[PDB]
RNA sequence: GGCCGCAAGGUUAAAACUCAAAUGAAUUGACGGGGGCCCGCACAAGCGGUGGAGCAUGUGGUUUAAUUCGAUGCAACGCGAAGAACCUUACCUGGUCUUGACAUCCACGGAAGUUUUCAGAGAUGAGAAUGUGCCUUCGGGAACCGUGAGACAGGUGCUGCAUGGCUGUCGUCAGCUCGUGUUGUGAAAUGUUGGGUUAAGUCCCGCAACGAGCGCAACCCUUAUCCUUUGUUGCCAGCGGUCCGGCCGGGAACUCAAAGGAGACUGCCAGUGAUAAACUGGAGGAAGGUGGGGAUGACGUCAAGUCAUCAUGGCCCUUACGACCAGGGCUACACACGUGCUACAAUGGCGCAUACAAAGAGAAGCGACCUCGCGAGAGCAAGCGGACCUCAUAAAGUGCGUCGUAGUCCGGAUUGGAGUCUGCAACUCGACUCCAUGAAGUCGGAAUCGCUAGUAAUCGUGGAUCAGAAUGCCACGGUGAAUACGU
């Protein structure tokens, strides 16, 4: 990928770590029943002033060696191509070709 | 296994995990000391419960 | 095939009576791996057919088949650029197979209310020498007779 | 057609792994990334010490790294002054206690990685590729192997049409799973583009 | 032009101009509507589909500000995509920056928590509080935030006809070659052909050949039958307690779990055959002649695919083809094609109520019991990093009623109203629930595809990507056929 995309990813992760607790509090306010019914309106209006990049759902998994946004596996942190390269070189403990 | 189109031509891999369980019925102080003062290989994961 | 010999598969006999012919019939009637339904239909049909003629189910079935078993048929040959019908003899296993197949195909095209009723009607008509099964036998025999010159 | 990787198809039958540790799903990825960075650093730093293999182990909360080399003197240095620096940097990268061991390769002429590295180095200084390949094969068969194969591909000699050539001597049975075959590769960057090298070496059945 | 002939014509016989070749005999291939032998769901014998309808999805074309780029006979078209509402994003319109959003250098001062106005936001301005560590021999500045100048950074921009690495296909076909010797002036040949046999350049016997290599078989995984070890979380024939339930005390026998071993070799019997290699039968045995299923892809062909995973030669732009930001588009619609799902009904639809599996996943996770709602769901809360808890109730099936051949009590497109959940945010453009509406279609022209046994056909179950979004892809079991005379 380009150099700017990984920069975007790092920025997103940082902000999402920074603003975690505030969002949890506001969402507890909005979700909980028997609330004042005006604190609800104020909280809904306030949750949209925090920066957009602070929501965990704006993040996209990428391979840690190249940056590819498609074909990602979670157990290994890499894409299919690099998984196969490492596997044949012998660098993934326990992995081997399977038949049955 | 191809960097572009071809949609057949796949590879299938496997990982296996082996598990064992051992019971000690009447531990003594010397036994617990001996156990806790042991070291084993670097590919074996050991968990001890009282 | 080209260089193969194929053996014969064993077939379990029916549970009510003990005939492999009826088992082959049930097999030829079944669809989509539902053997119990086919067994129900066949047994109901034989029950409703035994009364009409006052004889055992096996005897009625045999009588029905003996009027649809064929003897000669026609194959197609083309070596000189033209298609010729050549008459050949049929062997007993193929006789039985063709008879059952034609019976079932004729039954499926009728217009009664249930499959058991249609099958019983077809079997009775065949015993009486009427219906599409006997018509098919006659047509095949006519076609075989019309081409005796090519034997 | 296409061929299967010899090392990969043989793992678990006659060949050992290069990393031996257990982990769970929340540490697997991070362990792999750390290993990749350690290997990258060491390979860059010891570029002239004839390194062929790095074996990594992770016990307890520590990392221990074994380097296989054919020139231990250059790596160790004057009473360890270089091994110490390596250990410090590796511990900084791994984030835990670190330990380093050195093992010696007796015969460099029967190791696949070093042969390929030598051929690539020669090609970069404008040597004849036929000369390089024939020398490699002759040395291997002289020092006691049971078979060798060498292959070279690219814009050989400055040509405009690419090409591929290979040489062989002895036995190299690739469909036999109990045969002990060593395989590895290397790349050369010339003034006309990339050239690739592959080396197969046979040693006997097990 | 002369000579001859009734004629048709015969005989003697040039030049201008134009090209760099035209030709004989043999050699290795490829091809034949030439011959001979042999194989494969190739035909034949059979069972179920596609081509017609409605919907899902990819492609061509047309349209638009933009509808981002790539794949194109078999061997592109549910293909890169294992999951486009913003992000992803590479495309369009408008607002902005210039040593730069991402690294190395120099020198001028200082670092993170909360909170106020103006912007769609990027981004400008006011404030309040704090003084970190650490040879301070004062030079530490490591750690990390500012501005300033120039070496530089940056490019999903072009060429896969400059390349490395990786992949498709002929083809899981049985072939493809070398050293020494001998033959021919030579290109080359022999070996590798011949008589038998096999799934097989598999094996034997002959022969100017004698030997070796890459392929074929075998060593690797799984499945089916046994005995020896260890028995919790898994198992209950005998024994003995009863609130009936492996519950409780117990037992190590059986299912089962996972480490070591045994077994199948044409090994034994009869016949045929060159006193061979083999072939057709039989005994025992869980299994018989490659027992069934995988992985494993020879020298090479198609300037086959990929500079948009990654790396790289050469070219091109640097206040712009490099940065950042909110809205839109990749989801358009006269039409043409490929791949699928649901049906066109009594071997069936609807209502009651009752047997029998396998393999998997789970801490920003899987969510029992209880209560509330017609329902999707909501509240309060045990257990579980797991042979223990949770996802989790298999369906087709069997038993009893109703419907009686109707565009129907078959089918479930489209559209109106009211809701639930994830997420800052569901207009363009999400999945699901309730009430209502109830379209096409009665088995599909010329063509054309899959399958040889636990196979086709039919019924249910799980996982990867993933906040949410499968009728696709990859895996698991239940019921269970028809036909092979022959080339």
GROMACS .gro file of N, CA and C in nm, chain C residues 17-119:
model
  309
  167UNK      N    1  -4.370  -6.040   0.174
  167UNK     CA    2  -4.342  -6.164   0.106
  167UNK      C    3  -4.190  -6.178   0.096
  168UNK      N    4  -4.141  -6.272   0.017
  168UNK     CA    5  -3.998  -6.292   0.007
  168UNK      C    6  -3.941  -6.286  -0.133
  169UNK      N    7  -3.989  -6.194  -0.215
  169UNK     CA    8  -3.954  -6.190  -0.356
  169UNK      C    9  -3.857  -6.077  -0.386
  170UNK      N   10  -3.752  -6.109  -0.461
  170UNK     CA   11  -3.661  -6.009  -0.513
  170UNK      C   12  -3.720  -5.931  -0.629
  171UNK      N   13  -3.813  -5.991  -0.704
  171UNK     CA   14  -3.878  -5.918  -0.812
  171UNK      C   15  -3.953  -5.797  -0.757
  172UNK      N   16  -4.024  -5.814  -0.646
  172UNK     CA   17  -4.096  -5.702  -0.588
  172UNK      C   18  -4.000  -5.598  -0.534
  173UNK      N   19  -3.884  -5.641  -0.484
  173UNK     CA   20  -3.785  -5.545  -0.439
  173UNK      C   21  -3.735  -5.460  -0.556
  174UNK      N   22  -3.708  -5.524  -0.669
  174UNK     CA   23  -3.667  -5.450  -0.788
  174UNK      C   24  -3.777  -5.353  -0.831
  175UNK      N   25  -3.903  -5.395  -0.821
  175UNK     CA   26  -4.014  -5.306  -0.855
  175UNK      C   27  -4.017  -5.184  -0.764
  176UNK      N   28  -4.001  -5.205  -0.633
  176UNK     CA   29  -4.002  -5.094  -0.539
  176UNK      C   30  -3.887  -4.999  -0.571
  177UNK      N   31  -3.770  -5.054  -0.600
  177UNK     CA   32  -3.655  -4.972  -0.637
  177UNK      C   33  -3.686  -4.888  -0.760
  178UNK      N   34  -3.744  -4.949  -0.863
  178UNK     CA   35  -3.775  -4.874  -0.985
  178UNK      C   36  -3.880  -4.767  -0.959
  179UNK      N   37  -3.965  -4.784  -0.858
  179UNK     CA   38  -4.067  -4.683  -0.829
  179UNK      C   39  -4.018  -4.570  -0.741
  180UNK      N   40  -3.918  -4.592  -0.656
  180UNK     CA   41  -3.877  -4.491  -0.558
  180UNK      C   42  -3.821  -4.366  -0.626
  181UNK      N   43  -3.833  -4.253  -0.557
  181UNK     CA   44  -3.777  -4.126  -0.603
  181UNK      C   45  -3.711  -4.053  -0.486
  182UNK      N   46  -3.591  -4.001  -0.509
  182UNK     CA   47  -3.519  -3.912  -0.417
  182UNK      C   48  -3.484  -3.979  -0.285
  183UNK      N   49  -3.459  -4.109  -0.285
  183UNK     CA   50  -3.425  -4.177  -0.162
  183UNK      C   51  -3.535  -4.184  -0.059
  184UNK      N   52  -3.658  -4.215  -0.100
  184UNK     CA   53  -3.770  -4.234  -0.008
  184UNK      C   54  -3.827  -4.374  -0.030
  185UNK      N   55  -3.767  -4.472   0.037
  185UNK     CA   56  -3.809  -4.610   0.016
  185UNK      C   57  -3.939  -4.644   0.089
  186UNK      N   58  -3.962  -4.585   0.207
  186UNK     CA   59  -4.081  -4.618   0.285
  186UNK      C   60  -4.208  -4.581   0.211
  187UNK      N   61  -4.210  -4.463   0.148
  187UNK     CA   62  -4.327  -4.421   0.073
  187UNK      C   63  -4.357  -4.518  -0.041
  188UNK      N   64  -4.254  -4.560  -0.113
  188UNK     CA   65  -4.275  -4.652  -0.224
  188UNK      C   66  -4.326  -4.786  -0.175
  189UNK      N   67  -4.274  -4.833  -0.062
  189UNK     CA   68  -4.323  -4.958  -0.007
  189UNK      C   69  -4.471  -4.948   0.030
  190UNK      N   70  -4.510  -4.836   0.091
  190UNK     CA   71  -4.651  -4.815   0.123
  190UNK      C   72  -4.736  -4.821  -0.003
  191UNK      N   73  -4.696  -4.749  -0.107
  191UNK     CA   74  -4.777  -4.743  -0.228
  191UNK      C   75  -4.792  -4.882  -0.289
  192UNK      N   76  -4.681  -4.956  -0.299
  192UNK     CA   77  -4.687  -5.088  -0.361
  192UNK      C   78  -4.777  -5.181  -0.282
  193UNK      N   79  -4.764  -5.181  -0.149
  193UNK     CA   80  -4.843  -5.274  -0.069
  193UNK      C   81  -4.991  -5.240  -0.076
  194UNK      N   82  -5.025  -5.111  -0.068
  194UNK     CA   83  -5.165  -5.072  -0.082
  194UNK      C   84  -5.221  -5.117  -0.216
  195UNK      N   85  -5.143  -5.100  -0.324
  195UNK     CA   86  -5.190  -5.140  -0.456
  195UNK      C   87  -5.216  -5.290  -0.463
  196UNK      N   88  -5.122  -5.370  -0.414
  196UNK     CA   89  -5.141  -5.515  -0.421
  196UNK      C   90  -5.260  -5.558  -0.336
  197UNK      N   91  -5.281  -5.493  -0.221
  197UNK     CA   92  -5.397  -5.526  -0.138
  197UNK      C   93  -5.526  -5.496  -0.212
  198UNK      N   94  -5.537  -5.377  -0.271
  198UNK     CA   95  -5.659  -5.342  -0.345
  198UNK      C   96  -5.674  -5.423  -0.473
  199UNK      N   97  -5.568  -5.486  -0.520
  199UNK     CA   98  -5.576  -5.565  -0.643
  199UNK      C   99  -5.610  -5.711  -0.616
  200UNK      N  100  -5.572  -5.763  -0.500
  200UNK     CA  101  -5.601  -5.903  -0.471
  200UNK      C  102  -5.750  -5.931  -0.468
  201UNK      N  103  -5.828  -5.840  -0.410
  201UNK     CA  104  -5.972  -5.862  -0.398
  201UNK      C  105  -6.038  -5.873  -0.534
  202UNK      N  106  -6.003  -5.783  -0.626
  202UNK     CA  107  -6.070  -5.776  -0.755
  202UNK      C  108  -6.063  -5.907  -0.832
  203UNK      N  109  -5.959  -5.987  -0.811
  203UNK     CA  110  -5.939  -6.107  -0.891
  203UNK      C  111  -5.935  -6.234  -0.809
  204UNK      N  112  -5.946  -6.227  -0.677
  204UNK     CA  113  -5.954  -6.350  -0.599
  204UNK      C  114  -5.836  -6.442  -0.618
  205UNK      N  115  -5.715  -6.388  -0.614
  205UNK     CA  116  -5.594  -6.470  -0.621
  205UNK      C  117  -5.482  -6.396  -0.549
  206UNK      N  118  -5.374  -6.469  -0.522
  206UNK     CA  119  -5.264  -6.414  -0.445
  206UNK      C  120  -5.195  -6.300  -0.521
  207UNK      N  121  -5.130  -6.213  -0.445
  207UNK     CA  122  -5.068  -6.094  -0.502
  207UNK      C  123  -4.957  -6.132  -0.600
  208UNK      N  124  -4.875  -6.230  -0.563
  208UNK     CA  125  -4.767  -6.272  -0.650
  208UNK      C  126  -4.820  -6.325  -0.783
  209UNK      N  127  -4.925  -6.407  -0.777
  209UNK     CA  128  -4.984  -6.460  -0.900
  209UNK      C  129  -5.041  -6.348  -0.986
  210UNK      N  130  -5.111  -6.252  -0.925
  210UNK     CA  131  -5.165  -6.142  -1.003
  210UNK      C  132  -5.054  -6.063  -1.071
  211UNK      N  133  -4.946  -6.035  -0.997
  211UNK     CA  134  -4.834  -5.959  -1.053
  211UNK      C  135  -4.771  -6.033  -1.170
  212UNK      N  136  -4.750  -6.164  -1.155
  212UNK     CA  137  -4.690  -6.241  -1.263
  212UNK      C  138  -4.779  -6.240  -1.387
  213UNK      N  139  -4.910  -6.256  -1.367
  213UNK     CA  140  -5.002  -6.254  -1.480
  213UNK      C  141  -4.996  -6.120  -1.551
  214UNK      N  142  -4.989  -6.011  -1.474
  214UNK     CA  143  -4.980  -5.879  -1.536
  214UNK      C  144  -4.853  -5.865  -1.619
  215UNK      N  145  -4.741  -5.916  -1.568
  215UNK     CA  146  -4.614  -5.898  -1.639
  215UNK      C  147  -4.608  -5.980  -1.768
  216UNK      N  148  -4.664  -6.101  -1.767
  216UNK     CA  149  -4.648  -6.189  -1.882
  216UNK      C  150  -4.710  -6.133  -2.009
  217UNK      N  151  -4.796  -6.032  -1.999
  217UNK     CA  152  -4.853  -5.969  -2.117
  217UNK      C  153  -4.777  -5.845  -2.162
  218UNK      N  154  -4.673  -5.805  -2.090
  218UNK     CA  155  -4.591  -5.692  -2.129
  218UNK      C  156  -4.446  -5.730  -2.155
  219UNK      N  157  -4.403  -5.851  -2.121
  219UNK     CA  158  -4.268  -5.892  -2.154
  219UNK      C  159  -4.246  -5.889  -2.305
  220UNK      N  160  -4.145  -5.818  -2.355
  220UNK     CA  161  -4.114  -5.821  -2.498
  220UNK      C  162  -4.010  -5.927  -2.533
  221UNK      N  163  -4.000  -5.955  -2.663
  221UNK     CA  164  -3.912  -6.060  -2.714
  221UNK      C  165  -3.805  -6.009  -2.810
  222UNK      N  166  -3.841  -5.923  -2.905
  222UNK     CA  167  -3.747  -5.869  -3.002
  222UNK      C  168  -3.760  -5.718  -3.003
  223UNK      N  169  -3.652  -5.650  -3.042
  223UNK     CA  170  -3.651  -5.504  -3.051
  223UNK      C  171  -3.561  -5.462  -3.166
  224UNK      N  172  -3.546  -5.331  -3.184
  224UNK     CA  173  -3.472  -5.275  -3.296
  224UNK      C  174  -3.362  -5.183  -3.245
  225UNK      N  175  -3.241  -5.201  -3.296
  225UNK     CA  176  -3.128  -5.112  -3.273
  225UNK      C  177  -3.101  -5.030  -3.398
  226UNK      N  178  -3.026  -4.922  -3.383
  226UNK     CA  179  -2.992  -4.834  -3.495
  226UNK      C  180  -2.848  -4.857  -3.537
  227UNK      N  181  -2.826  -4.871  -3.668
  227UNK     CA  182  -2.693  -4.886  -3.724
  227UNK      C  183  -2.672  -4.783  -3.834
  228UNK      N  184  -2.550  -4.729  -3.841
  228UNK     CA  185  -2.516  -4.628  -3.941
  228UNK      C  186  -2.366  -4.640  -3.969
  229UNK      N  187  -2.332  -4.708  -4.079
  229UNK     CA  188  -2.193  -4.721  -4.121
  229UNK      C  189  -2.179  -4.672  -4.265
  230UNK      N  190  -2.288  -4.677  -4.341
  230UNK     CA  191  -2.287  -4.633  -4.479
  230UNK      C  192  -2.348  -4.496  -4.499
  231UNK      N  193  -2.363  -4.421  -4.390
  231UNK     CA  194  -2.423  -4.289  -4.396
  231UNK      C  195  -2.574  -4.287  -4.383
  232UNK      N  196  -2.638  -4.403  -4.368
  232UNK     CA  197  -2.782  -4.412  -4.354
  232UNK      C  198  -2.816  -4.495  -4.231
  233UNK      N  199  -2.928  -4.462  -4.168
  233UNK     CA  200  -2.970  -4.528  -4.045
  233UNK      C  201  -3.064  -4.643  -4.076
  234UNK      N  202  -3.028  -4.762  -4.028
  234UNK     CA  203  -3.108  -4.882  -4.044
  234UNK      C  204  -3.149  -4.935  -3.908
  235UNK      N  205  -3.270  -4.990  -3.902
  235UNK     CA  206  -3.321  -5.057  -3.783
  235UNK      C  207  -3.293  -5.206  -3.798
  236UNK      N  208  -3.224  -5.263  -3.700
  236UNK     CA  209  -3.182  -5.402  -3.704
  236UNK      C  210  -3.253  -5.476  -3.591
  237UNK      N  211  -3.322  -5.587  -3.617
  237UNK     CA  212  -3.389  -5.660  -3.509
  237UNK      C  213  -3.295  -5.750  -3.431
  238UNK      N  214  -3.306  -5.744  -3.299
  238UNK     CA  215  -3.226  -5.825  -3.208
  238UNK      C  216  -3.317  -5.888  -3.104
  239UNK      N  217  -3.267  -5.996  -3.045
  239UNK     CA  218  -3.337  -6.068  -2.939
  239UNK      C  219  -3.311  -6.003  -2.804
  240UNK      N  220  -3.409  -6.015  -2.713
  240UNK     CA  221  -3.395  -5.964  -2.578
  240UNK      C  222  -3.375  -6.082  -2.484
  241UNK      N  223  -3.299  -6.061  -2.379
  241UNK     CA  224  -3.273  -6.163  -2.279
  241UNK      C  225  -3.359  -6.141  -2.155
  242UNK      N  226  -3.376  -6.244  -2.071
  242UNK     CA  227  -3.480  -6.238  -1.967
  242UNK      C  228  -3.467  -6.122  -1.870
  243UNK      N  229  -3.345  -6.088  -1.828
  243UNK     CA  230  -3.329  -5.979  -1.734
  243UNK      C  231  -3.379  -5.849  -1.796
  244UNK      N  232  -3.340  -5.823  -1.920
  244UNK     CA  233  -3.387  -5.703  -1.988
  244UNK      C  234  -3.537  -5.706  -2.010
  245UNK      N  235  -3.593  -5.825  -2.036
  245UNK     CA  236  -3.739  -5.837  -2.046
  245UNK      C  237  -3.806  -5.785  -1.921
  246UNK      N  238  -3.763  -5.835  -1.805
  246UNK     CA  239  -3.825  -5.793  -1.679
  246UNK      C  240  -3.807  -5.643  -1.658
  247UNK      N  241  -3.686  -5.593  -1.682
  247UNK     CA  242  -3.661  -5.451  -1.660
  247UNK      C  243  -3.754  -5.365  -1.744
  248UNK      N  244  -3.762  -5.394  -1.874
  248UNK     CA  245  -3.846  -5.315  -1.962
  248UNK      C  246  -3.993  -5.323  -1.921
  249UNK      N  247  -4.039  -5.443  -1.884
  249UNK     CA  248  -4.179  -5.457  -1.845
  249UNK      C  249  -4.212  -5.366  -1.727
  250UNK      N  250  -4.130  -5.372  -1.622
  250UNK     CA  251  -4.158  -5.290  -1.504
  250UNK      C  252  -4.152  -5.142  -1.538
  251UNK      N  253  -4.051  -5.101  -1.615
  251UNK     CA  254  -4.037  -4.960  -1.648
  251UNK      C  255  -4.159  -4.908  -1.723
  252UNK      N  256  -4.205  -4.983  -1.823
  252UNK     CA  257  -4.321  -4.941  -1.899
  252UNK      C  258  -4.445  -4.934  -1.812
  253UNK      N  259  -4.464  -5.033  -1.724
  253UNK     CA  260  -4.581  -5.030  -1.636
  253UNK      C  261  -4.583  -4.901  -1.555
  254UNK      N  262  -4.470  -4.867  -1.494
  254UNK     CA  263  -4.468  -4.751  -1.406
  254UNK      C  264  -4.487  -4.622  -1.485
  255UNK      N  265  -4.424  -4.612  -1.602
  255UNK     CA  266  -4.441  -4.492  -1.683
  255UNK      C  267  -4.586  -4.474  -1.724
  256UNK      N  268  -4.653  -4.583  -1.763
  256UNK     CA  269  -4.794  -4.574  -1.798
  256UNK      C  270  -4.878  -4.531  -1.679
  257UNK      N  271  -4.850  -4.588  -1.561
  257UNK     CA  272  -4.928  -4.551  -1.443
  257UNK      C  273  -4.917  -4.402  -1.414
  258UNK      N  274  -4.797  -4.347  -1.423
  258UNK     CA  275  -4.780  -4.208  -1.381
  258UNK      C  276  -4.861  -4.109  -1.463
  259UNK      N  277  -4.906  -4.147  -1.582
  259UNK     CA  278  -4.974  -4.054  -1.672
  259UNK      C  279  -5.126  -4.061  -1.661
  260UNK      N  280  -5.180  -4.142  -1.571
  260UNK     CA  281  -5.324  -4.162  -1.561
  260UNK      C  282  -5.387  -4.041  -1.493
  261UNK      N  283  -5.516  -4.052  -1.460
  261UNK     CA  284  -5.589  -3.940  -1.403
  261UNK      C  285  -5.678  -3.974  -1.286
  262UNK      N  286  -5.639  -4.071  -1.204
  262UNK     CA  287  -5.713  -4.102  -1.082
  262UNK      C  288  -5.658  -4.017  -0.967
  263UNK      N  289  -5.700  -4.047  -0.844
  263UNK     CA  290  -5.678  -3.956  -0.733
  263UNK      C  291  -5.546  -3.980  -0.661
  264UNK      N  292  -5.507  -4.106  -0.644
  264UNK     CA  293  -5.386  -4.141  -0.572
  264UNK      C  294  -5.299  -4.234  -0.655
  265UNK      N  295  -5.170  -4.234  -0.622
  265UNK     CA  296  -5.076  -4.318  -0.696
  265UNK      C  297  -5.110  -4.465  -0.681
  266UNK      N  298  -5.151  -4.506  -0.561
  266UNK     CA  299  -5.190  -4.645  -0.541
  266UNK      C  300  -5.308  -4.683  -0.630
  267UNK      N  301  -5.408  -4.595  -0.639
  267UNK     CA  302  -5.522  -4.623  -0.725
  267UNK      C  303  -5.481  -4.634  -0.870
  268UNK      N  304  -5.396  -4.542  -0.916
  268UNK     CA  305  -5.350  -4.547  -1.055
  268UNK      C  306  -5.276  -4.677  -1.082
  269UNK      N  307  -5.189  -4.718  -0.990
  269UNK     CA  308  -5.114  -4.841  -1.012
  269UNK      C  309  -5.205  -4.962  -1.016
   0.00000   0.00000   0.00000
